[PDB]
C-alpha cells in the first residue's frame, strides 16, 4: 500500500526487520527503509 501511494521512505519497529526482508526484491525496489526501536530515533529521521 505504501508503494501505491508513491511513498519514498518508511519507518518500522526494528523487531520486524525480519519479515520485511522476506518480500521479493522487486517489491522492495525504490524504498528507503529506516528500522528503529527507541522513539528518539524517529524524531531525528523526520524533522531535521
Amino acid at each position: 500500500a505504501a508503494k501505491r501511494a508513491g511513498v519514498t521512505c518508511i519507518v518500522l519497529p526494528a523487531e520486524n526487520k525480519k519479515d520485511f526482508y522476506d518480500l521479493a526484491a522487486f517489491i522492495t525496489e525504490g524504498l528507503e527503509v529506516h528500522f528503529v526501536e527507541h522513539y528518539r530515533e524517529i524524531f531525528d529521521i523526520a524533522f531535521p
Binding site: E15, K17, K18, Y21, D22, E37
Partner: protein, 48 residues
C-alpha cells in the same frame, strides 16, 4: 510459559526436512544451529 508454541516450531522444522529428503539433495538432514536460520528463518524475539 506453555509448550504449545515450541511444538509448532519443531513440527515445522521436521516437515521441511521431509521436503529435503523426498526430492531434494540430502539423504539425511542434519540440523545444526548455524544451519537453522535456513529452515525456520530469522530470529523473532531478541530484546527481552
Amino acid at each position: 510459559s506453555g509448550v504449545r508454541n515450541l511444538q509448532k516450531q519443531v513440527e515445522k522444522v521436521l516437515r521441511k526436512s521431509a521436503y529435503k529428503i523426498v526430492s531434494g539433495e540430502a539423504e539425511s538432514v542434519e540440523v545444526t544451529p548455524e544451519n537453522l536460520q535456513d529452515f525456520v528463518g530469522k530470529p523473532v524475539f531478541t530484546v527481552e
